[PDB]
Amino acid sequence: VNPTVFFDIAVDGEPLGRVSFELFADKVPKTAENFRALSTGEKGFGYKGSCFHRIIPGFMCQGGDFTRHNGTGGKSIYGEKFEDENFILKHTGPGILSMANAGPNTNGSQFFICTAKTEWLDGKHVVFGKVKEGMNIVEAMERFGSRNGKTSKKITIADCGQLE
Amino acid sequence: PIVQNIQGQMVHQAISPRTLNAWVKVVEEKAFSPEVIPMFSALSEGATPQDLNTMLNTVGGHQAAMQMLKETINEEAAEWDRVHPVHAGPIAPGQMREPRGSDIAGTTSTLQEQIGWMTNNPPIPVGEIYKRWIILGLNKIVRMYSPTSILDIRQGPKEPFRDYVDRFYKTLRAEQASQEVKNWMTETLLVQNANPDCKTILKALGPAATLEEMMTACQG
Amino acid sequence: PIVQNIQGQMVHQAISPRTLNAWVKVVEEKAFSPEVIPMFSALSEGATPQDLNTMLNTVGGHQAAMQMLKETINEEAAEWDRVHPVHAGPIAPGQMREPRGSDIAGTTSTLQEQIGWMTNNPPIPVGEIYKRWIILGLNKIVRMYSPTSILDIRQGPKEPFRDYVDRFYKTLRAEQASQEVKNWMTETLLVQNANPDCKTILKALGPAATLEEMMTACQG
Amino acid sequence: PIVQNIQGQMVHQAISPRTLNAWVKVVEEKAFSPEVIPMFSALSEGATPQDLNTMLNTVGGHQAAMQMLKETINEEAAEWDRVHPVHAGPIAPGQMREPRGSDIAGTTSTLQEQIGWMTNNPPIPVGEIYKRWIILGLNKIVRMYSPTSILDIRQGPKEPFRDYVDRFYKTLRAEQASQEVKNWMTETLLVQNANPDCKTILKALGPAATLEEMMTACQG
Amino acid sequence: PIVQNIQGQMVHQAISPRTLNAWVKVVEEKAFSPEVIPMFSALSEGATPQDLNTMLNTVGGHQAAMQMLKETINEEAAEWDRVHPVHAGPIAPGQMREPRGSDIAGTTSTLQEQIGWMTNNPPIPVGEIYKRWIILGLNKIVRMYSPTSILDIRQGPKEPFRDYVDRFYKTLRAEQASQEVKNWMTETLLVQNANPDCKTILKALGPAATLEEMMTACQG
């Protein structure tokens, strides 16, 4: 019933590990379909070969800008941006997968994986999934980031797709 | 607008009704003239974008000018967005996010966000940027409201030199051009468009004569 | 209206007379125009429902408009009662009971209850709700006082383009049917009703033309 | 067009002559009316870019509309190439090179390459992208064929209300300016242009009146 | 529409162009007859809401009737939301999607969501609900298209009983009423409005006589 997608992560081309995500399509369906479809690449464009452009140790890893590769772009499968579906789920801990945005109703394709409890984000970013397998791969990724987000090595989504 | 409050902590103080009444009166009698831009800058010192929006909404009439101002504000916002891109992502707990192109115009930015952007260290000059945009718009409007061009200013046969130079300098100030061009424009147009007798009187003084000598020449 | 003190807390303050005088003067002198709503919103910032009932009852003349506003406030109060139903059962020790649709207006509640509602923990913005209702009523009033519809606008052969666009945008701001429909109207109806000569001068610039070039085309 | 097999896989299939005949006949008989886009989207589900270029080149007559569609497809392909630059160098063995705008259009690529793109892992929807572009072009074409504007609608003294509303909604569906603007138009312009007798019969029901009672009022 | 595919696994099969052509032809040739409802219900067996939207968009002309149909679909969706709101309850162990008024009407529901709601166990009858709504709308339309009232059906002086009863039963089927009202009307109105020459014949047979007895009585 709820889809599961994976990401094979790479640090400058060396394979690092697989993170897999359960998308809560039963509560945030339109948000979950957009991450699912961008992971499969079935609509022609997507996450494969994009990188995490902003990694802040102890906060979150952000990625998903496949058009401009630096947080200023990305687009959804419904057009460039769409509404905040709802705020049922909250940022309760590491592994929560939440939507990045540029204020309300500006969701595109950027997402962030929390590596800590970030309750201040509640009510401001739609949560739509959580890490299933691979959280120590997300944790190891932190080491390649910095206080301001700049990463030291290129961290890419080498491959991604749907598992179930 | 925010103001330094005893002691050393800026707190938000809403715009006073007397300031709004003064603004409505100056946009009722002075209407649109060169002096309105300086009056506006003095009535809205350190004003949050909400206060400037309030001061621009209270103007009754002249809807074309207000629409020009709104469109130029939108154009400046688009240019600021094209020059200062805003990266998406979660904000830091200590510092505030970089304001977008429309967060300056107070359209989608709540008052608390603006107060934060102003009182934070380092401060974000949202108020001064929006004031620069409104001042560009007001310059456009006052250069549009000019009845005649500066090239059309000519003195009447018996019209005294006083009224002629007053009207000429008023139209020149209302006109929009670089100061370097004005330096040639004055020395080329002031003496030429005068009355023939006063024309010869000023030419007897010399080409580089100052304004006071040129005046006291034809005085009376 | 409540006012903050040096320690930061707020307490009721008697309404200033030259606020009531200014409101009565602006209501009578300017009658009803789109620029009465910003003045009203600026005059009564933080005013209690008693102060708003004062500022409304004090308006002598134009009693039909005041009755329209009363009816609009009446319907709005009924909707608030219908949307939220009071809960039953035991109440928490740190919390106490809320006001009704009619008490938001302040018709059947004393001033001390309004002050307690406004300075409670957490504060309840009854003043802002009643101000929103009054602003909606004033919008409907200024809609009624519109002297024409948006479609009937047709510029005369001699009426200058400036006066035409002024009248257009005046009755457009007085229309307030929507915001995107306004954006479509300013593209279509503005270009569709020009005088033939200046009409084809505007058509020479195509639909991409902005308002500034639109007016300086017909200018001079 | 691709078609799934018994075991679930899909492979290219020759275009049926019945589809082409039906498309050409509906284009000839129904000209360019709002009901060609749904039938076009239904006829060519899963069709390759070669099949769409066939269905477009096969349309004899109305060559101006086909040229408009070609220009729109060209602009969309240029924007796609600008937003998605293609990489150079050797291509991976398990991946086929990504198509450019002119190749998304299917102008400079073989049918086998289209089939490989459509049946790749993951599949690349070139057919759906080019179908979206053709649908946008057809929307622009049906906009161009629109005989009259939406504002010029006025019912004659004898023209029945049924024919009036038929013509109104026909040109309204042919307008396609927006959705909320259409919703505002069907509230205002529909009742604003009725014949005086039936006009006041509709005004007797107020703005809350729906279309059914709007019609059965003037009925009989 | 989805169809049982070998073996036992329903997969989505797009609507065939021949079905759409048959629908367009039956709406062109037969206009809006009482029989279209059965033809529509039989042409779209088990159709996804997208297929019914396609079949309602492919219609040519009769835009007023399509507007009544859309408005009644909206009303049914509104009532459906009102009759099926989410009341607080313990969450089910198993979660299945849910169709909203807008999710049933195929407006904001993607094809995959509808396929899910249909093929899931237990199935959600979105297709049958939307078909009931469209059938109610078509009943409204065909009862509106009635040229004359059933009460006005009267036989001509030499009009044979054949054509008289044919037209009478056709208008009665187009008319809307409960079955008992029709049972009373066929006994009170049919014999009375007949031609007196054969009216005497029908009266001679008896009040509770069947249709075939009267028909063979006035035969010839």
Question: What domains can be seen in chain A, in order of their start residue?
Answer: 1-164 (2.40.100.10)
Instruction: Name beta bridge partners: D3.
Output: D11
| Residue linked to tokens 């600026």 | C42
CA–CA distance, D75 with D71 (Å, rounded to integer)? 6
Tell me phi and psi for residue A90, to 5 degrees: -120, 170
Chains B and E touch (3+ CB pairs under 8 A): no
Rounded Cα distance between D167 and D157, Å, is 15
State the Cα–Cα distance between residues C169 and C34, nearest whole angstrom.
11
Instruction: Quote the DSSP letter at residue C16.
Output: P
Our answer to whether residue A107 is catalytic in this structure is no
Contacts with A149 from chain B: Cβ below 8 Å: 89
Q: How far off is chain E from A94, nearest CA to CA, in Å?
A: 25
Query: Subunits touching D (CB < 8 Å, at least 3 pairs)?
Result: A, C, E
Nearest CB to D38 within list E54, E62, E71: E54
What is the phi-psi region of residue C126: left when phi exceeds 0, alpha when psi lies from -120 to 50, beta otherwise? alpha
In sequence order, the 6+-apart residues with CB closer than 8 A to the CB of D107 are D53
What the block records as the tokens of E86 is: 């989410």
A2, A101, A162, A163: which is the annotated catalytic residue?
Answer: A101
Residues of A in contact with E95 (CB under 8 A): 1, 26
Give the 3-state secondary structure of residue B112: helix
Chain E, nearest residue to D213 by Cα: E68
Contact A160, D122 (CB under 8 A): no
Q: How far is CA B164 from CA A162, B153, B167, B194, B210, in A?
A: 82, 8, 5, 8, 16
Q: For residue B98, what is the DSSP state?
A: P
Long-range contacts of A100-107 (CB under 8 A, 24+ apart): A100/A62, A100/A64, A100/A71, A100/A125, A100/B88, A100/B89, A100/B90, A101/A125, A101/B88, A102/B86, A102/B88, A102/B100, A103/B100, A103/B108, A105/A81, A106/A81, A106/B88, A107/A31, A107/A34, A107/A76, A107/A81, A107/A82, A107/A83
Task: Encode burial over C62-79: b for 16+ CB neighbours within 10 A, e otherwise.
Answer: eeebbebbeebbeebbee
Q: Which of A35, A125, A128, A144 is catalytic?
A: A125
A69 is catalytic: no
Q: What experiment produced this structure?
A: cryo-EM
Q: Is A36 a catalytic residue?
A: no
User: Would the CB atoms of D165 and E61 count as touching at under 8 Å?
Assistant: no
> What are the distances in angstroms from CA D84 to CA D8, D76, D162, D173?
32, 12, 50, 34
Which residues 6+ apart lie within 8 Å of A159 measured at CB?
A: A7, A8, A48
Say how many residues make up chain E. Answer: 220
Helix or strand or coil: residue A162? strand
Residue in C178, C188, C189 closest to D180 by CB: C178
Task: Give the residue from chain D lying closest to A161, CA to CA.
Answer: D122
Which residue out of A6, A24, A52, A112 is catalytically annotated? A112
Residue pair A105/A11 in contact (Cβ under 8 Å)? The answer is no
Are the beta carbons of C184 and D178 separated by less than 8 Å? yes
User: Side chain identity at E168, as an amino acid letter?
Assistant: F
Provide the residue count of chain D: 220
For residue A151 the two structure tokens come to: 């990463």
Closest C-alpha among A162, A159, A130 to residue A22: A130
CA atoms within 13 A on the CB side of D158: 0
Q: Taking CA atoms, what residue in B is nearest to C20?
A: B17
In angstroms, what separates the C-alpha of B57 from chain C's closest C-alpha?
A: 7
User: H or E segment at A63?
Assistant: strand A60-63
Contact C68, C141 (CB under 8 A): yes
Q: Positive or negative, the Cα torsion across D190, D194, D199, D202?
A: negative
SS3 content of chain E, % helix, strand, coil (to 5): 60, 0, 40
Instruction: Say how far apart CA C125 and CA C120 lie, in whole Å.
Output: 10
Amino acid at C200: T
Q: Catalytic pick from A62, A66, A107, A128? A: A62
Alpha-carbon span E156 to E152, nearest angstrom: 12
Q: Which of C128, C120, C124 is nearest to C49 (CA)?
A: C128
Separation of alpha carbons D53 and D130, rounded Å: 10
DSSP code of A82? B
- Structure token digits, residue C141: 């009033």
Query: Helix/strand/coil (H, E, C) string of D173-203?
Result: HHHCCCCHHHHHHHHHHHHHCCCHHHHHHHH
Annotated catalytic residue A59: yes
Phi, psi for A10 (deg, rounded to 5): -135, 145
Closest chain D residue to the Cα of C192, Cα to Cα: D151
- Distance between the two ends of chain A, CA-based, in angstroms? 9
CA distance D168 to chain A (A): 31
For the stretch C53-56, contacts whose Cβ atoms lie closer than 8 Å and that sit 24 or more positions apart, written own/partner, are C53/C105, C53/C106, C53/C107, C54/C15, C54/C20, C55/C20, C55/C23, C56/C134
Tokens of C124: 């309840």
Q: End-to-end CA distance of chain B: give it in Å, rounded.
A: 50
Q: Is A53 a catalytic residue?
A: no
Q: E-chain residues within 8 Å CB-CB of D6? A: 6
Q: E75: burial class by Cβ within 10 Å (0-12, 13-18, 19+)?
A: middle
The amino acid sitting at D151 is L
Chain E adjacent subunits, 3+ CB pairs under 8 A: A, D
Q: How far apart are CA A155 and CA A145, in angstroms?
A: 10
Of A42, A45, A67, the CB nearest to D123: A42
CB hemisphere CA count around E127 (13 angstroms)? 21
Report residue C179 as tokens: 């915001």
Query: CA-CA distance, B68 to D56, in Å (whole number)?
Result: 45
User: Cβ of E68 and D166 within 8 Å?
Assistant: no
Structure tokens at C5: 């003190």
Tokens of D20: 């082409």
CA atoms within 13 A on the CB side of E65: 23
What is the Cα–Cα distance from C214 to C161, expressed in whole angstroms? Answer: 10
